[PDB]
């Protein structure tokens, strides 16, 4: 049952003509705002956002409380309060501390909603319930129905981030296994998930994965459909293994089968499968109500059974053998923390999220030193090498194209069947190397097209301080083939690659590309299509996660009004305010 | 809408006949629970309590999730989880912080439900979401359908209290005027109502009340119905005023009219009146969505107009000219902290609450000196005089008799109109003394019957500590008329009276009657009928208000299990645990 | 390298003869202490305790600085300062915050040790580093070298506990699996182990155990030995499974084989096995450096592979197919918190530890109702069924016997091989009930001999409060054969049983037997032989873990001096002391 947005039309309660004068414009402003969001935006799942409107305009507590009754029955997880006139501050505001809120005041003189806004905001900050401000840059006339650029931008950025918050609430992270090679992020912090995101964590031991394959706790016909799809579509790459370690044709397909079964069995665990009920396996059918998940893999799975690379790549992809669909969020090396970043990215943009190891920083001096060539253009100042250990969403090739014909990544509802297969055609599946993946496996190798805007994000936990976010907006570069193959042969050529250059501000961590990587707080990161830092920043305020690091333009910063009271400085305000309000849910 | 109780039947997840073998009993047990609550309990307003059972038994996150969706659209604000078997702990618990919750495990051996209870509870306190334990004293045979008596007490005590938490949530306290005569409780701490109770505060200047009377903003037909009704029933008391400050009948009619108007205009303010819409006054029709109020009175109102003595009495009573109805909660002198006690007591009992000033402690030495005869029986160790400034719930006369035919106060739905008139028959209406109340008034004078159990409660705000709760289970007593008459003349004989004897423990404040007076945290207190200390204590723990003074036996103290982990000592664990979890809402 | 005990003799600084008088006495008293300790105490593993003395006698900063670097060199985890004279306080105290320290002032008149003790403690508590205080009631003459009874208890109790804290520092807890059946204790909290105990947690997925048994990563020679032993010594009980679920003998051989192979494999993982390195399995030969360990089992392993009933039971015993050894600590269901109470139990007593489900409380009324008979003697007031879900240290049969020939448990170095076979011939190996344990297994069933004194303990984590300790001293009982069989039948007759009865104080949780269970913090607990509540209380205090529940007479309560400054109440002092000082390690 999807969350909804609740519009609260708010009004001057005084009569003898004043209320009746204002009613129509007020409710129409409400309607306007439903209209704007519902057409402009979608859930990440794909569905149409349903906005709920109060039965009458609110001018005080009786009317205000009817709305709450109407909203609770209707699962509203966000609200916007809209008005063109002055109304009675604290009597009319929304006091539920759990939901993100925003106040839109019509910037006018004849209709001075802007005035009420600043007062209703001051009530919010005084009662410890922060709210966002929507304030038009230019005074409009009282007979105008248009919505300016700025207002619409905020209205939408707000709603984009509010629907993310409410979508996580009440849902599960599924931890298939636990700690992978002492990686911090795989030490799943149930209190972080419960207190900040409002999630439950379900832990499942990887023998549960094994059990499902063996005891035939999957859809047997789907396996054949999957394999059929696998055969027609999968272009294989070079085996790189030592000769005595190679696998014959029959062994190679048993690996492949298992790999596919793992993908299937994980999905069955995350979201359930009615077919297993029919098949009689009634217990296993319900799933763990999980919108994100991790798979440990190394060391203990991959030292005997096939690595999860295929399964991870297919589940993070927008498409598979059953057609196009909304991508899953499955973290490799069970990196619950990178999964959070993915899950936010997913819910903010509706697109596939590229899991990525932050492998190498290529210094301009260093690249001249081994390729003989110069880093040129976007890579002038240095390059960074994003390359996961055998898995990534296939959407990352960027064979998807926009309307202007440039390479990009897109929502699942915007994706035609031809673009699905085009992305497969960019993908060669190289066997895993047996010293590390003794059970075998297949990598998904691709190269992300150059010149794509990307947002590198990461969430870390810092003892004594809590969770923090890191952001680095940038671009993928496309190096000369001569240079590329030699840095690729240099690293791990079996694996998917992305060349990333980050926007520099010449300040602090973004002074030079070196320090960007040097101030990263983990070996992993998530790549989200686009420049979305401004949207990420707003979500981190809503969760009261401060941002230790970002290159987003100061003008673009959008947070609850309460934050500005915590200081003029954009960074300093964030730590005090986050400390103040603390986690949302407990 | 009214709040509902969610019942969560929880079950072992495994099949092969295991879940099957239990579904029946586990479902039957939720139904038995909802039935009992629904039969033996009512809302404070007299409505039937609905209960919502989960669609399926719960064994994991997915079923648990669907219970939540069901519960959210159904306005449930209390849960009880029931099981007769072991289940999967943290997967199956209710996670919402803002709801009171309980767990009831079947004390069986074939059915080891208490073994899940113990694990679930440990889960709760590890995850900072405390919950109540319901464990039956005696092992029960698997086929037994009956609910033990000790289990019934706990279930009901929990429901009774939980409903009160959920009833206050989102309602208003209407403060009519500001501070009265420097009384701390008249400084309305808006944050306390928000954070602790989940209510809001509406402030109305008393000029508004004047305005309604001036501009005839009230159902005019009602007024002559009121006035008619009083003329038929109101006894009158001697004018203890001076000769020059006495009033001719014409003047007296003016105050009584006004005294009865205030009752109606305050009531109309608190909840609203559709008649006012019908007469064109659509703004005033609505009300402030208020379940409690307070009226300032002195000095600024009582120095010109008639005091609220009469209004307050009738409003807090369980009947008026329109017959027997659920009482209101209006605080004399705008004592919002006496308001809260009144509110809490009323929600726990359904009955009317007696506002009292805590006027005199009469020593046994002191009584013998002024009357020549000693206090005897229940008054053996001292008496405390409880007498409010002119007002009190007429039901406080205790003219009502119960099933065994002895003095009491019943929930309004067990009040026959015949009894209603007996409480009016024992009340004499006496004029206000002019020097204090210049605008005059009438004061409901009655004498409470002896031997009636009472609990006396107060809430107080201690800066740097928060809200605290005082409780004192005791008896009202009858004194010999000669004795009573002397002590009434010294104090105020136009004012209603109750002679209170607190039950002693011989320890702390309850070592003697003097100490009970001397520790009481304010000049005002509240009388709830019967011995309801246990219910208050439970309610207090649900709201995380520590209890600082009580004479309830140690076995009766019922609180979440987490409390026990903060220490064996019932006073020590309470402060520490209350310090830990803090106010419920923010 | 085990920790050592550092003994500090301290002396009056001043020379000119007086110092020189005391030097002989001062260190003769320190050598007595080192002799007393190493005579009456041994390490839990069996080794003799090594007491390092300071090279000189300490009288100022200079000598005390030498003594530390010597003490750092020798691995002392505990210090005991002794003296028979005045010395210079702030100059002579051990200042290392991590080591648990005690000070032993001699009670003489010519030799004023008492005075030094108070000034030293005062300096300690003023400098934030609590220490214990040893003081004899009765005064002794300076020529007397014998050490009195009461000083002996305080020295032994201190060193016994300080060694516990010392032995756990830097060691690891091995988590074989993740969360078991949503049990809080099996959500291993890494930061608890680290901060409070100075331990690490190593997480291994249960698939790694699979690999070791499938790829023969074990000693195959021992395996045959084990099977041989198993055939010779194992008695079997009857199969209580359904017929269609009964295993034939070919299957029962494999199930047994793997159960035993689990034992061996889990051991290897904990401490290393060098036979493996010879065998070319060098990486698996090191192990994880573990002094406790949890095994998850349900649900994921037990739904396809044989359970750990047998393995757990054999590892936690004081003997196996290689004869008598220091028992291991393996927690069933990966309940790490029960593991911690086992670890503590073990370190303090050197015995085996019994892991229990706190399954049923049998009120007198209940036992009369069902058996027709009444409980009697120690069982007079109630009885609590302690029964683990398949596995328990076989020592728990209490077939081992003491000097007088009374039932008991002994540390592994006082257990005759004849005794171990006694313990084993009390057992019968019942096959696992198929529907809970699909994979099979063998549940070690015995009946604990009555009259034995026992201590039940538990550790819980409370959000906002941190860890806490539960203690209940009592005895096991022996009921009439007829009564036992009625009670056992309906419960779980294939599983090991212990009838426990807690000493009642009349107060709080120990007012009666119902309360004991009712306030118990989890489904699980640990049985440690005898009445060692006094020991756990002392170890808790060194560990800064409040004691929320205990029935130890307060005469025996022994904690650091600083505690006394936090109040007279033996409970309030504790919570305040623990919140002040908090975890030893970060
Ligand atoms: Mn990696
Ligand atoms: Mn008063
Ligand atoms: Mn158990």
Numbering used by the authors:
A (entry chain B), B (entry chain D), C (entry chain A): 5 to 590
Task: Give verbatim lines from the article.
Thus, we speculated that the addition of Mn2+ to the RdFucI crystal would increase the binding occupancy of Mn2+. After soaking RdFucI crystals in a solution of 10 mM Mn2+, reliable Fo-Fc electron density (> 6σ) on the metal binding site was observed where the position of Mn2+ was clarified in all subunits. However, the temperature B-factor of the Mn2+ (76.56 Å2) was higher than that of the whole protein (60.69 Å2), implying that Mn2+ ion is still not fully occupied in the metal binding site. Mn2+ was coordinated by OE1 (average distance: 2.62 Å) and OE2 (2.65 Å) atoms of Glu337, OD1 (2.72 Å) and OD2 (2.72 Å) atoms of Asp361, NE2 (2.52 Å) atom of His528, and the water molecule (2.79 Å). The average bond angles of Glu337(OE1)–Mn2+–Asp361(OD2), Glu337(OE1)–Mn2+–His528(NE2), and Asp361(OD1)–Mn2+–His528(NE2) were 127.32°, 86.25°, and 73.96°, respectively. The bond angle between ligands and Mn2+ showed a distorted octahedral coordination. The structural analysis of RdFucI showed that apo RdFucI contains Mn2+ with a low occupancy in the active site, whereas the occupancy of Mn2+ in the active site of RdFucI was increased by the addition of Mn2+. In contrast, the activity of isomerase activity was increased by addition of Mn2+ because the occupancy of Mn2+ was increased in the active site through additional Mn2+, which served as a platform for more substrate binding for isomerase activity. Therefore, the binding affinity of Mn2+ is considered to be low because RdFucI does not stably coordinate the Mn2+ binding sites by the ligands. As a result, the addition of additional Mn2+ may increase the occupancy of this cation in the active site of RdFucI.
The enzymatic approach using l-fucose isomerase, which interconverts l-fucose and l-fuculose, can be an efficient way of producing l-fucose for industrial applications. Here, we performed biochemical and structural analyses of l-fucose isomerase identified from a novel species of Raoultella (RdFucI). The monomer RdFucI consists of 19 α-helices and 23 β-strands comprising N1, N2, and C domains. In the asymmetric unit, RdFucI subunits form the hexameric formation arranged as a dimer of trimers with D3h pseudosymmetry.
